[PDB]
Subunit: 273 residues, 6 copies
Amino acid sequence: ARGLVIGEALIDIVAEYVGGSPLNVAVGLARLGRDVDLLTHIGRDARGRRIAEYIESSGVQLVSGSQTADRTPTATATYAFDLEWQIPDTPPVTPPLLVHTGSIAAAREPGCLAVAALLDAYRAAATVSFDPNVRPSLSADPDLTRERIQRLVERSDIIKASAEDLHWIDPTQPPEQTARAWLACGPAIVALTLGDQGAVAFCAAGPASVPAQDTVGAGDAFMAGLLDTLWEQGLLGADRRTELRKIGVSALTSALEVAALTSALTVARAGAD
Amino acid sequence: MARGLVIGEALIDIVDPDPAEYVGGSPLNVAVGLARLGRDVDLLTHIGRDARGRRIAEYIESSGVQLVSGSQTADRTPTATATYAFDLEWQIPDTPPVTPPLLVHTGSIAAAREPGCLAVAALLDAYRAAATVSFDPNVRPSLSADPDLTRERIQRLVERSDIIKASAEDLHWIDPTQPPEQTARAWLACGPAIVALTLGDQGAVAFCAAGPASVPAQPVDTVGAGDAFMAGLLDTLWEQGLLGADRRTELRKIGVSALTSALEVAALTSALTVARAGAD
Amino acid sequence: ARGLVIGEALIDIVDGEYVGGSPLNVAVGLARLGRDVDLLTHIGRDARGRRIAEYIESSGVQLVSGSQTADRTPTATATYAFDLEWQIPDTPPVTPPLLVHTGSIAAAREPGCLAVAALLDAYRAAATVSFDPNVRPSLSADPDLTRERIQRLVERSDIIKASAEDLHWIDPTQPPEQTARAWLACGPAIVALTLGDQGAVAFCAAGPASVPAQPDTVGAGDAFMAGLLDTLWEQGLLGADRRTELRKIGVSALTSALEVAALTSALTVARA
Amino acid sequence: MARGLVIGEALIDIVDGPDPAEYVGGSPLNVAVGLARLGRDVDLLTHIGRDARGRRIAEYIESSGVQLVSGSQTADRTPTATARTYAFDLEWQIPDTPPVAPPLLVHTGSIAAAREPGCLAVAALLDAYRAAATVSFDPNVRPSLSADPDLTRRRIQRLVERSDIIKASAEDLHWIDPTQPPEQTARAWLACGPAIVALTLGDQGAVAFCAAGPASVPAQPVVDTVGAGDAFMAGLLDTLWEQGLLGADRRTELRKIGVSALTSALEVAALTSALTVARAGA
Amino acid sequence: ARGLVIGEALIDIVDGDPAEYVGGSPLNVAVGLARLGRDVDLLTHIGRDARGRRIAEYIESSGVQLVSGSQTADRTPTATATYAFDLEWQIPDTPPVTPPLLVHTGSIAAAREPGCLAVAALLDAYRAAATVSFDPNVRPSLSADPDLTRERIQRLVERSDIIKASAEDLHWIDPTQPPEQTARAWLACGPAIVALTLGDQGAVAFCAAGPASVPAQPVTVGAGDAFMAGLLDTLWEQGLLGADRRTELRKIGVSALTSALEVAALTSALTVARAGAD
Amino acid sequence: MARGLVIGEALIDIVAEYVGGSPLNVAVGLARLGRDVDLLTHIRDARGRRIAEYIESSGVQLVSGSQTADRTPTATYAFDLEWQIPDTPPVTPPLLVHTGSIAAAREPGCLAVAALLDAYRAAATVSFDPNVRPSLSADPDLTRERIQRLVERSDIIKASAEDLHWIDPTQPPEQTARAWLACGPAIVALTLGDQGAVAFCAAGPASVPAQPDTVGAGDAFMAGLLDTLWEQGLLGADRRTELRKIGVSALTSALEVAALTSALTVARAG
């Protein structure tokens, strides 16, 4: 029962904090009590040391080859990015129960090709989950990254996205339209957060929703709570792919509720301080 | 007094806690719901001459619904067991002994299950010179029947209906690639006067030529509540004087305001049916 | 730095007399919020026209010359029946406005609607163009002509506001948000859509915005429009000089303008 | 004494254009006529009118040696299919229980297998006859789709499960599943209960599958493809009849047919079809 | 009504005092279409050296109009005999011609930086007016990240109306599946037609209406490009090119597609036969 | 120096009795093509000395411990046969070990066969021909399992469309073959009756058309395939990577030689 997360860890400079949407998911799952491996790309500099200690002090096992970057990637607040995404293409862990990726790691060369490869590798053993987490302020080529997202959708079992992500993906369509088009491409579950309007999700059995419950990391905490409940329902792992697709509306609604409340609790505990 | 006709399944729900058996079938609930609101209603169904069949008949009679002659020819009264397995035959006489009704309602299993569904389609055609036609697809989650044939059959009933009510779940099953409101608006364009769409704890919406209508959600079974919504909707359009073939043009011209009131009455009838049963 | 409103002004006649007209209400709403506004219309030289003229001057709106030529002042009678003509000079006597707004009957009714469409193209060089279809089909016309004219105004507009009822009548086969997003992709920077007690939504390149509800039917719709134009004005996004900054409006800025518009409309209702 | 029963449409094919013409047609009718011409005794249950076209059809049926089943002539008017653009004027209905002794073989396919209301009665007749009869089926979707462009695949798949012998074209199976080569679909059909699934590949010959393995036959050097496919079907059924594999009594032997016996059935079917075409040349 | 071909023009140098020939797979398709009577523009990347003057003369002789901005290369590209490339592929991303009826690309122009980014842009700029056709014609010997190459092929597959590939192309794209399966899967991404040549076994093609096949022809370099020109030329003649006919192209019947395959196979075989003559 | 090793059954075919057994035919085929070959089998009576004489008159050498069979197994198909081999043969490391048919599937001997192939692969190319004969009653599920394990340890595999149909009737035989190629083998060859043969390797597929007949033809195809890969210099463990890298041109030549060897065997018979 191990999870594998592949994606960027970085430093958010406003003062500086440890960030990266794939890192937040990894640390979110571990805080919830799961065994998580994190393949990433940080430095051996002061930042990459603070990142590695933040990872270590969270229970997330840092996969070897993750500290090979020249400089530790940074996001300086509308965001300015100085980052390189590249990871060893060799499968570094015993095949996990779950492989999760998204954000910059899924769409940025040269790591994005290895990630899609690695995803293709572990897919026969692991459930694939993905969060596009569109950060347009990072470089560009909108068509390439729009196309790479669409190809990861086609490879994925579980998808979570925000209405803002899907509006970037296709402004001509309501985000529910886009999410339903994504479900038709293969996934068992497409979850859609709607900010002040709550969250909805779609599976073959039907739509689910949770009502209205904007700070950094709320989306990744939602994703972690989603994967953790699906894990707890016994639907992760390729062994359980066929019943992931068959999840009932009541189960999905309850996974959605837990993910929405997990995200809200992470916000409220961060607002207390 | 003008009469309503409901055509559709009556069955026993066998709930496998403390095993119990309940009278059910969505068209039966609609017939019973219309009768309890004070309407005269006939039900054409397919049950057996057996223990369960005689109970359905007694429960039908108790609430004021008249059973149409020829409804009792099944070898065994249909049942549904909750892993939600069905033991159901659906068949009806091609030419039932019924004088022209003001309203004919069908839906659910009766609308899509062979061989009775063919006669259901034909009877809607024959009755619509006198009767308003209403339709509730109410896809039964088991819905063991072939998906594509079911979609085709539902679509042919849409084209023959004046009033349609469906849930968001219904329409997602009909077409998972579109939001339910898209499907409902495509249904309205095929001839109905009104397509109503229930949205769970988000209330209900409805569409007519004049425009959209909306009702916010209220504060036990979802399909039982759905059938009381349907009976409330038809009873209130009945009261507004819009039922009957002779009123079909006025029904198609219903105002957004009249439609909104029909929707409020429907949503309150349904919530009140739940609240009263929940207090036992 | 003035705004120009082009549209009908009429008297609303109840079943069994009030100063009306969707464009006139937007002009008065803008005048009431402190903006200098010119209104070009078609009110007759008769008792009804004088009341409209006094109402306009009291509000602070300046009537445009050549707008008082109507053969008979147009009238709206409640259902609604219209005794109305709509005619405007090919070329109004006004310096280039910062903003030109039209809609409703003026956009669709001949012959005046033909000048409107040309004036909007000519004004875009100086003016933000705003449009509110505010469908009134009780004044009959070829329905596909009406739809064709509306679509061409959409293509020449920077700001559109419409009701779910309007877009239902425009295309009953689509949900109104689909129509609104299709309109947005035809040039406009902002399409705002009111949904009744479900609030309002608006779309721009940056993303969607929304405000919830409960915070006169078209009376309140026109005041929503005035409040929307006034806040965008105050945000410094009006004028051809600011068109690219309008098209880049942020979801936060658009949410703010939606809120001010919703509150402006509610406050107009509540005060009267 | 043993008799075959064919259930399916007889119709008039109208060619509207250069030298317009009216032909007797209907793929199940062709199969019945083809079996009678090969010497078999055959009843045809169908749905034609007592109008001018209906009498032409009935005369063509009797001249071929096919016996028209009673109840076959209650149509308000004889079905037609017009190629102007394809237009059908066709009703398909049959009595629930026809006046026929238990046949050795019951064949259906094409429009009659898929068109309401008659297709319901067809599917129940197959279930009732299989205790005495081998069941054969030819989906022949091209005319079906021309008639019902929204036709659904489930109608066909229900008949697959009821059948002992299936013949289809690559074009048929591509429509059933365009994502897979037609041989994939044929092998999936085989695993649902048939003893034999034969697949014609046009100018590449034909293949077939049974439990014992695959068989194949090369293309003929030499079009009325529907017509040629029906003679192929008639020749396949006639030669399995000859080999003593028809009848419920022979069903286990039919499932056990050897690759060699299946290959010979296919050659005879292929040659029967080619010979039927060549004799139409003159 | 003009076609526009976008792709590499190079010189093939034989293994050996080795001879040189004007080549490049998209070049060959443009020349092929011209020789069949169509008006064709070719956007390419050649030098003003002597090898580039030879290509230009060949283009000129063949009836093909060379597209402005095609002579910018620092050197004319070369392939030498497996093959070894001294090749740069860079082209203006600005639409250089009035929207054509057909835009065709493939081979190295499709998958090689930087010009492949421009190819995708020009295809996107012209698709509302032009049919898009594409032949992957993989040349793996040209050193490149194999997964980046696969990605860029896929993004052209999603843009295309007409695809032709060899069994060997699709094997290199996906070794695990029969080429017929990769072709059916490509047909699912948007194309109207995915044609597949199978060497000594003939050719097959797939559309929404069904598969088509043509037998093996009784009869090496550039036969595939001649097949592509013959396929596009017949579809041209059948009236299915141009975005205004895109709906009709997807509706192509098996019989029409079969005719197109036959003409394509005969055009390929005739181009080989005339080469063995000379 | 380099010797081939065949492990499999040797049989009598009762029509009229003829020497049979598919591995014996491959071994005999290789000897008749000029290769040096040892045959390890299970065979001490008038039929054994019949087979043993056939084995030595064709040039094959029997491996000591072969003629331990109580009765030489029989095929009349009705199979009267037992299959047992020593866990470790007295054999120096071969360049090539070939097994198949009953020997790969029948207890007890089949359990040694699978480990023997794991031991020999440090020196030898491993080849396998399933040559399915279900008339020999056995739990098909384990039989299917034993065949799959052998596929995992094989470098060269040849099967008929009939073989792969019995393995998985629900797949086109080219699909089963291309899936077999994915578990290790460098080459999977598939004969298609009168449609010729196909073979799959990493560099791409090969094909040969049909040829204008016993299942000795299949065996003689296998002997021709092995013999021509031997000649191309691709057998032995130290050539295994060049075998995996066989080109389509070279694979096509091997298919052709194998098809023609098989054709020539049947023609030179009648």
